[PDB]
Structures are given as structure tokens and as C-alpha cells.
Amino acid sequence: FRKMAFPSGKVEGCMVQVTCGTTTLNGLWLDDVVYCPRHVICTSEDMLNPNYEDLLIRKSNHNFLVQAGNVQLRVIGHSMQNCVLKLKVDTANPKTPKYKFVRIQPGQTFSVLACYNGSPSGVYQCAMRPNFTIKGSFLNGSCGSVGFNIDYDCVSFCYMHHMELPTGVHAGTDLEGNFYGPFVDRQTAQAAGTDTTITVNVLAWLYAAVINGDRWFLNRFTTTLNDFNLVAMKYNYEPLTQDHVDILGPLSAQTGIAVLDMCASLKELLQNGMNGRTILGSALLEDEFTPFDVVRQCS
Amino acid sequence: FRKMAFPSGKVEGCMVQVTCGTTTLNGLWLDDVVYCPRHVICTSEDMLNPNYEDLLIRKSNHNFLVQAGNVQLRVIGHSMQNCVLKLKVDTANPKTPKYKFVRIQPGQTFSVLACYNGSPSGVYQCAMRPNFTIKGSFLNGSCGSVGFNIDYDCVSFCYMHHMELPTGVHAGTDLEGNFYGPFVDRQTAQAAGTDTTITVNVLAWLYAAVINGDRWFLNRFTTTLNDFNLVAMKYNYEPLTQDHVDILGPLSAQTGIAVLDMCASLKELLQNGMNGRTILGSALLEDEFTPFDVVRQCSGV
Ligand SMILES: *[C@H](O)[C@H](C[C@@H]1CCNC1=O)NC(=O)[C@H](CC(C)C)NC(=O)OCc1ccccc1
Numbered sequence: 001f002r003k004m005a006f007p008s009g010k011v012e013g014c015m016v017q018v019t020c021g022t023t024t025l026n027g028l029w030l031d032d033v034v035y036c037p038r039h040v041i042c043t044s045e046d047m048l049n050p051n052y053e054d055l056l057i058r059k060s061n062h063n064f065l066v067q068a069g070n071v072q073l074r075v076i077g078h079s080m081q082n083c084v085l086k087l088k089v090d091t092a093n094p095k096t097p098k099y100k101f102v103r104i105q106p107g108q109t110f111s112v113l114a115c116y117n118g119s120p121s122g123v124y125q126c127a128m129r130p131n132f133t134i135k136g137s138f139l140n141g142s143c144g145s146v147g148f149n150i151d152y153d154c155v156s157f158c159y160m161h162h163m164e165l166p167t168g169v170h171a172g173t174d175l176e177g178n179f180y181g182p183f184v185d186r187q188t189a190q191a192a193g194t195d196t197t198i199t200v201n202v203l204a205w206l207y208a209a210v211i212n213g214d215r216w217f218l219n220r221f222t223t224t225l226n227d228f229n230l231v232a233m234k235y236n237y238e239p240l241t242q243d244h245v246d247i248l249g250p251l252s253a254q255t256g257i258a259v260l261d262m263c264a265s266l267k268e269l270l271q272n273g274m275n276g277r278t279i280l281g282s283a284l285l286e287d288e289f290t291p292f293d294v295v296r297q298c299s
Numbered sequence: 300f301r302k303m304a305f306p307s308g309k310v311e312g313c314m315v316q317v318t319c320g321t322t323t324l325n326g327l328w329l330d331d332v333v334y335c336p337r338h339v340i341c342t343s344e345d346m347l348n349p350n351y352e353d354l355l356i357r358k359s360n361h362n363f364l365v366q367a368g369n370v371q372l373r374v375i376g377h378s379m380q381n382c383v384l385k386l387k388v389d390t391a392n393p394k395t396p397k398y399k400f401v402r403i404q405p406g407q408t409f410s411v412l413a414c415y416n417g418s419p420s421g422v423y424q425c426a427m428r429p430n431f432t433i434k435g436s437f438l439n440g441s442c443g444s445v446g447f448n449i450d451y452d453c454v455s456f457c458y459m460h461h462m463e464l465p466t467g468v469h470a471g472t473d474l475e476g477n478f479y480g481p482f483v484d485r486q487t488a489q490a491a492g493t494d495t496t497i498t499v500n501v502l503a504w505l506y507a508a509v510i511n512g513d514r515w516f517l518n519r520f521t522t523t524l525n526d527f528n529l530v531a532m533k534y535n536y537e538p539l540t541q542d543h544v545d546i547l548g549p550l551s552a553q554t555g556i557a558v559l560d561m562c563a564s565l566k567e568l569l570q571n572g573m574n575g576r577t578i579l580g581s582a583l584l585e586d587e588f589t590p591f592d593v594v595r596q597c598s599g600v
């Protein structure tokens with residue numbers, strides 16, 4: 001049982017490099033449009049406090065240098081949608097997959113294809129934290145890298161990278177240009193809300209540990225849904241809903257452990273700690289596997 | 300600090316399915332050759348105790364179904380090389396990347412593209428353990444999935460998947476069909492040797508901590524390589540090779556911390572524990588990041 005990302009080939013064929021003056025970042029080329037973060041139009045001084053509409057009206061098509069590998073693509077239009085710039089190009093990307101733009105909810109997961117200068121560097125799995133940050137691995141020049149899920153050949157784009165907070169976590173937008181969370185695309189120190197742990201994910205991962213022959217944390221105690229949620233909230237865990245309990249149904253049926261029995265197990269785990277033991281090789285309770293992630297990997 | 304796979308697109312374009320009778324696994328299509336585990340030619344019952352030379356005698360080119368998606372590739376020749384089958388097909392794969400076949404050492408990492416029915420399913424980072432197993436995530440029908448590194452557009456294939464051991468770890472071959480470790484492709488009870496911690500990777504991880512400012516564990520001592528190796532073995536840590544000292548060179552230069560000084564720091568951690576302190580926010584010493592993985596992630600490679 002490992003943190004597993006989607007194969008990135010369908011997205012790799014869409015990455016390009018976008019340059020305006022001195023600033024370089026990545027763009028997503030679908031059909032005849034290139035999507036990228038709007039702060040590519042900023043100089044260093046601009047970034048500190050930009051007025052984007054005012055900055056954008058002063059740009060021409062030829063201020064945008066888009067490169068797909070060695071080939072320049074000619075920009076023939078441009079518009080702005082929220083924090084995302086849409087560059088109309090004179091060539092259609094032949095490698096455009098079947099795709100959709102989706103806005104994901106907190107606790108959901110996706111794969112990130114980290115890119116620099118329009119070239120893919122690495123792929124890894126992330127979750128949208130409840131405070132709408134993501135614990136990523138991004139360096140300078142990674143903006144415009146996207147997050148995605150893949151279902152039967154259709155790529156669901158859910159994230160585009162824009163920045164790193166002073167705490168080292170990351171913030172971005174959906175493909176419509178709207179930030180996840182209370183962040184803005186300005187070069188200013190920004191704090192996130194207090195993060196919480198994704199409870200339904202922790203339970204899914206505890207079920208993964210059982211499917212893989214680890215049971216040390218189980219007990220014979222029981223709990224009601226409301227009594228578990230009281231303890232969970234006390235420990236900065238998100239509430240468990242009945243929808244979550246249902247979503248865990250297959251994992252419960254597979255292992256024969258009722259959801260509320262696994263809740264009792266996690267409650268003890270939260271109140272006693274792990275006593276220096278590990279679960280699936282982890283000294284901490286892991287919350288970036290969804291129930292579907294566990295099912296996909298285990299079955 | 301997270302495990303990051305290589306982008307998998309160059310390998311995805313090479314995955315096909317190979318069927319004999321009812322047995323289907325994955326194959327690797329490079330130029331006009333398809334590489335796959337030789338037990339594709341086994342029936343359910345023949346896997347218990349297979350005679351591969353005799354099983355292959357009864358096979359002809361026309362007994363092999365090679366498909367890229369639903370499109371059949373005609374097999375025009377077959378041979379066995381160690382535990383892999385090489386199927387000559389009549390079409391050169393137009394998506395063949397620049398590539399090499401390499402045999403990796405214990406402790407080296409690679410990305411695995413897990414495939415089923417020749418269809419890629421996920422990608423994750425693995426390390427070759429010192430007992431020559433990998434802690435993989437594989438299901439029925441994953442055999443023939445490959446593990447690989449990429450350097451400057453050249454894909455180095457290092458692993459092809461063949462089996463699961465009773466402890467739940469996995470075993471396989473290089474792309475010349477030579478098993479890593481002392482395993483055989485027979486459905487027999489086999490057991491991985493006792494595992495050990497990958498010292499060179501723990502050291503890499505200590506350097507990564509130092510690069511990020513977490514350096515409380517740096518002590519005022521040093522040690523010789525031989526003295527360190529003798530103590531490390533007492534803690535179930537691998538001995539260091541001369542090549543291990545050399546691949547730590549770049550991190551040693553970047554931090555100004557001598558490799559043998561860092562060794563003496565790790566020794567103190569082994570003899571006294573961490574005293575309830577963390578390193579990169581972990582209470583456990585991590586051993587599946589190589590020196591290259593640390594560099595690759597701190598740079599924009
Ligand atoms: C895009 O390549 C870049 C990604 C950052 C670079 C460092 N790690 C990343 O993920 N984005 C920015 O540099 C971004 C641009 C703004 C105009 C949105 N700025 C940023 O991330 O700095 C945030 C920050 C500002 C001031 C203090 C502390 C952090």
C-alpha cells in the first residue's frame with residue numbers, strides 16, 4: 001500500500017512554457033488555448049502589489065512568448081478569467097486528452113505533475129487540506145503546474161499552482177482561476193486557517209492497514225457517531241458525516257469491521273497515542289488517502 | 300519532504316498486454332521487441348513447478364497475443380532470455396524513448412508504473428531493499444509492470460515485476476530477466492532474507508535535513524569508514540561501500556559536512572536514539588530517499 005499518483009502522460013503532452021518579459025512559468029495547452037497563472041504578466045515590482053486588469057490591458061499578444069518544446073506558438077488572443085490567463089494560440093494541441101475542469105472539495109485527492117520551463121519533473125499525490133492549502137513540493141518556476149485525476153481516459157483538472165506560504169504549504173486555483181482558500185496572488189506573506197485532519201481519510205487508511213494484515217490498533221470498544229465526533233473535534237479532526245460512513249461501506253464490508261467500530265479504534269488511538277508503534281510504516285496517522293484511493297489500490 | 304515519481308509518459312507509450320491461453324500480463328514494447336515475464340506461457344497448474352524450456356518448446360509465434368489496447372501486434376519471433384520472453388513483432392513502436400537497460404543496486408530507487416491488461420494504473424516510487432525485495436503495491440495481473448529512472452530524456456529500465464512473497468513484498472528481474480536476489484519464478488514458498496536499513500539513504504536524508512536548517516544532530520566527532528561499518532551492522536544497518544561515499548559527495552559539498560562526520564553523527568543517533576526529537580518533522584529515520592532523490596527534489600531537474 002503506497003501513495004500512488006495517476007499516470008501523467010496525458011497531462012505531460014499539454015504542458016508548455018509561457019514567458020512575459022523576465023517571468024517564466026508553465027501553461028496548460030488544451031486545444032487552441034493555453035491556461036496559465038496571470039502573474040506571469042508581472043514584473044518583480046508588480047508582484048508586490050498588482051492591479052491585474054490595469055496590468056493586462058497594457059499587454060499585447062506579442063508580449064507573450066509560448067514555447068511547446070522547441071516550437072514557439074503564436075498568441076492570437078488573450079483574456080483573463082479570475083486568476084488565470086487564457087492565451088489563444090494559432091495551433092491546436094494534437095495531444096489534448098478528453099478533459100474536464102472540476103473544483104474539488106477539501107479532503108479530496110489528486111495527482112500533481114510538477115513542471116519547470118514547460119517540462120515535467122515529477123508526479124506525486126496530494127490532498128486538498130481542510131484549510132484549502134496543499135502540502136506540495138514546488139520550487140521557483142513551478143507555477144502553472146496542474147493537479148488532476150483520471151477517470152477512464154478523461155482528465156479532470158482541479159488545481160493550478162500559484163504560490164508558497166511562509167509555512168511551506170502551497171496555494172492555488174481551480175482552472176477557472178478561483179483560489180482554493182482565502183489567498184490572493186500577491187507577493188505578500190499569507191497565513192492559512194488552522195488546519196484540521198481529514199477524518200474519513202484517516203479511517204480509510206486504517207482500513208487499508210487491516211486489508212494489509214495490520215490490526216494492532218483495533219479494539220472491542222464501540223461508539224456512537226455523535227460521541228466519536230465530540231472526541232474528533234476535540235483533537236482538531238473534521239466531523240464524520242453519515243455520508244462519510246456510507247462511503248466507507250465497501251471498506252467495512254470487505255474487512256468485516258463496522259464503521260463505528262473503526263471509529264472506536266481511532267478514538268483510542270487519538271486518546272492514547274501510538275505508543276511508538278507504526279501503522280503501514282507510519283509513526284503518524286495518515287490522512288491523504290480517500291476511501292476511493294484505498295479501494296482502487298487494494299482491489 | 301515527499302516521495303516523487305518520474306513523469307511516466309515515456310513509459311506509458313511502451314506498455315502492451317501479452318496473453319497466452321488465459322494468462323494475460325503486461326509487456327514492454329521497445330522498437331520491434333516486446334519484453335515480458337516468461338511465466339505468461341504457464342497455465343494455472345503449471346506455475347507450481349514449471350519446466351520453462353519444455354513449455355516454450357510447445358509454443359509458436361502464433362500462440363502469443365500481443366495487443367496495444369485492442370490492436371493486435373503480430374509476433375514474428377520469440378526467444379527466452381533468463382526469466383523474460385522477447386517477442387519480435389512486426390511493428391516498431393513509434394513512441395519508443397531513448398532508453399537503456401540497467402541493473403540497480405540495493406538502496407537505489409525507481410518509479411514503478413503499475414499496469415493491468417497493458418493499461419497504466421498508477422505510478423509510485425520504490426526502493427530496492429537490501430534483501431532484494433521491493434515494498435510494492437501490486438495486484439493480480441500486474442506482472443510485467445516496469446520500474447525505471449529517467450535522466451535527460453533517457454529512460455533507464457531497471458525492474459520488471461514477477462511475484463509476491465508471503466510477507467507481502469515483491470520480487471522481479473532486470474530487463475535481461477535476471478532476478479534481483481535469490482528468487483525463482485515458481486509458485487513455491489519462498490522467503491525474503493532479513494532486511495536491513497539503507498545507510499547511504501539515511502545519510503542522504505540527514506543531509507536534506509541540514510540543507511533545510513534542521514541540524515541539531517550534527518556532533519563534534521568523526522569516524523573511519525571501517526569503524527562505522529562495523530557498528531552500523533550491529534544496528535541492522537547496511538555497510539557503506541566506496542561508491543556510497545562518492546554518491547554522497549555532492550550533498551557533502553553543498554552542506555560543508557564531511558561524509559565521515561555525518562557518519563559519526565548517525566552513529567550517535569543509533570547508540571542514543573533521538574530523545575523525543577524529530578528530523579524533518581519525523582521521529583523515524585527515513586531510508587528510501589537516495590542522494591539523487593534529495594538533489595533531484597531540491598533542484599528543478
Ligand atoms: C511560481 O513559480 C511561484 C511558485 C513558488 C515559488 C516558491 N515556491 C513556489 O511554489 N509563485 C510565486 O513565486 C508567487 C508569485 C505571487 C505573485 C503569487 N509568490 C510566492 O509564492 O511568494 C509567496 C510569499 C511571498 C512573500 C513572503 C513569503 C511567501
Ligand SMILES: *[C@H](O)[C@H](C[C@@H]1CCNC1=O)NC(=O)[C@H](CC(C)C)NC(=O)OCc1ccccc1
Nearest residue numbers: 338346437438439440441442461462463484485
Ligand atoms: C503476476 O501478475 C503475479 C503478480 C502477483 C499477483 C499478486 N500480487 C503479485 O505481485 N505473479 C504471480 O502470480 C507469480 C507467478 C509465478 C510463476 C512467479 N506467483 C506469485 O506471485 O505467487 C504468490 C502469489 C500468487 C498469487 C497471489 C498472491 C501471491
